[PDB]
Amino acid sequence: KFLVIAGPNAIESEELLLKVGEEIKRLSEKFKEVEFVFKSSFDKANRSSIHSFRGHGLEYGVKALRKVKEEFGLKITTDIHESWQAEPVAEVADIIQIPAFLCRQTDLLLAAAKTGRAVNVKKGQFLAPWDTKNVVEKLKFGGAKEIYLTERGTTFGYNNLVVDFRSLPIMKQWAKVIYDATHSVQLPGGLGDKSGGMREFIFPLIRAAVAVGCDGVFMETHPEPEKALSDAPTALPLSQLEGIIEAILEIREVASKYYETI
Template sequence: MEKFTIIAGPCVIENKDICFKVGELIANLQEKFSDIRFVFKSSYDKANRSSHESFRGLGIDEGLHILSMVKKEFNLPVLTDIHESHQADLVSGVVDIIQIPAFLSRQTDLLLAAGRTGKEINVKKGQFLAPWDTKNIVEKLKFSGAKKFYLTERGVSFGYNNLVVDMRSIPIMREFAPVIYDATHSVQLPGGKGKSSGGQREFIYPLAKAAVSVGIDGLFFETHPDPDKALSDGPNQIPLNDFPDIVSNLIKLREFIVEENL
């Protein structure tokens, strides 16, 4: 990874206005921190919601249209997920980075289809995988011809409805590929509210500091203007107003650690 990368945006594309509000703030951060690469992230479809009654997104056509507008309006690279192999080519026409969701991180056909697009690939490590298991994911991506790819740590299942991040996983996974730390999904409580997931937002910042201290290549955040009213993953999204201070402090911490290790 050429630059330290921060991936951020609302969990799901709810509407253009929210995406533009978040996109504008991320663009302002990009202007302030020119040595950091900022990427806008949002999903056109959340195919793994706890309940079929939950909001999934605007769909692939409208979702990609809004992502293309964000990319053009704010001059930001954009990222979104795919869930089925046939989506890879269509999505690659808009986004800069294709993301493979954690639950699908072992799906060979999906990984190969994503890799063949020539786009950058970000794979969320499954909650059921040991860090050394990600070597097989990387081998599949290399086989597909992918040149730029990343692994994202987002915690491992720890009993029922709980995740824990083993910070040892970060240096292990960095032996295979650059590693991004997902600071918001790591505090998710999957299915913790019965028909939806809960989260412990108060632990996002301390765990992000820990990951930066261990040594990572990027950070992943979900942020929303009003997380308590978000239609997906509200409990583990950062309020948009708080996001600049959190990012600024983490960048300062990383700069200090890098200087100390020179």
């Protein structure tokens, strides 16, 4: 079944996680043919500015995520930034996410693989799609069995990203492919001491992704997007999720017959 990874970008509070988890649960009940994974970062370790919001700590985060998992029965995913975080995070995370800037850090990859959990690596903005085969090679060597590669855009000049959709079938040769719909339209460090984003392109590019063919979509959401303490320019209003999920499934159903084999 198609994978939908969604949640608020950062764990601003567990009240937030619960409110968003409530909607994700409703969506999981409505879309039985979709595997929903709740995502939220316990820490924003790569913010452009030392003044920006980071989070409330790994432990608080794991606790908030566990609360969502137990209250709504949803699978969880969160990212790690240094090797020691793999083990404590694997306690609650079904899927351990590896940040794009850190996609080549061997030890971080081996540490995630060692937990036995699934691993999803965001493709670096500096990495060519063919260069991802080696990334999968490290994770396999380390013992990983469920492996994902996420498309989140490529460096195109300064403060801008372009999505080379050719990367979807190329990467599918070595792993399941996830399309990060929110960060692919993000304009890196575009707002001075923060990054920007163009929400108007989120939906059309998602349509493109499922038309080309991928195994899932990653999309951040928030009850009040403009108020998000991280990635404000990109979060999708909670109410828009249902409509976009519906479109995804409908487009996939008519295009899947044309997806290239192997």
